[PDB]
Symmetry: C2
Subunit: 207 residues, 2 copies
């Protein structure tokens, strides 16, 4: 009844895990409710949303903008700037900020939008302000894996700022100039769910 005893199944995407809120919230919750036992699960946004609908999950850190999201309770979490992933050998790496029009001829190492949603749309809109649409070379299933392909000079990419913690050598990270491209995250749970453990986890996330 108090959410200090029981079980909570939290879902997250591999890209969202780099955002400090997901590990910071889980860490904060388990510190306050050590007897509650968490069942952590990784998956893309659509898969976790299907788990929440079927009852296999209780709460999920997912990307907003997925189909059917009007059924759940969505809760926007803080935004993240979108930065450019490029090699230290690239001439644009000498720039503090990179105007995307400079990179309109580079192969962009992106990801399927069904996975990205907000992350993917931020790239297209970011390039659209620079007057071009990105030239896509390869599409990687795991967004963080674009950094390793940038290391292989497969092209450039745009990732959330949190993925700067991925320090592969030969790759640098640069912010976007004259623009604020941003990545969005959301806390999702079932409407009407009065579970105390879920309630305690949301409140540690929120505020």
């Amino acid at each position: 009844a108090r959410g200090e005893s029981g079980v909570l199944r939290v879902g997250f995407t591999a890209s969202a895990a780099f955002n400090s809120v997901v590990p910071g919230a889980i860490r904060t919750f388990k510190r306050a409710y050590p007897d509650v036992r968490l069942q952590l699960e990784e998956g893309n946004t659509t898969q976790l949303a299907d788990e929440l609908n079927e009852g296999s999950l209780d709460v999920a850190f997912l990307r907003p903008g997925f189909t059917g999201n009007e059924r759940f309770q969505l809760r926007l979490l803080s935004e993240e700037p979108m930065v450019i992933v490029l090699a230290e050998t690239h001439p644009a790496a000498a720039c503090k900020q990179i105007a995307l029009s400079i990179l309109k001829d580079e192969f962009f190492l992106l990801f399927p939008r069904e996975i990205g949603l907000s992350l993917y749309d931020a790239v297209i809109k970011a390039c659209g302000k620079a007057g071009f649409e990105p030239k896509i070379g390869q599409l990687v299933p795991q967004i963080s894996s674009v950094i390793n392909l940038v290391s292989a000079e497969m092209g450039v990419s745009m990732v959330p700022d949190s993925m700067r913690q991925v320090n592969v050598k030969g790759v640098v990270y640069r912010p976007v100039a004259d623009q604020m491209p941003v990545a969005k995250l959301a806390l999702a749970y079932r409407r009407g769910d009065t579970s105390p453990t879920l309630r305690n986890f949301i409140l540690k996330v929120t505020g």
Copy 2:
């Protein structure tokens, strides 16, 4: 083999090993006209794609089923390290004797994804005199290190995974033994593809 197509497979963790970005980099410079198709996925997926013909060569972990009708070349044996949260008590150690983590929860990947890497962890702990208490099961080692930052437990990852530099996490070498993450090059034996032949040369030398 200046023309044609080549399909190279690799796992998420193997992409952090210098052998994979280095070979793709050198091959791209030597044969720009060759269409390179990179595919990600765990070892069993890549091995099944090699067998059906969807891929030509893969950087995967040993211990998958079969290795029959395939040519396997071991490429790197790399040391494994402990992943700990800064707040964890064992983080103070410069080097970690494995026995001190006997009662710690471990974050790991399922054996299906892991194979030899997972076995190496079980084997290393068994030599330390204990069976690990796998706190959670996550598919990506990058997610393992992120959950370590959530103080959900500890883990043992390849030395190349130190490049993840997630805040709130530290890496420590094992003091009293040498757990090893292995990487390998798998391709179809008898495949006379010049692009495959040339790519293997950039891998082996």
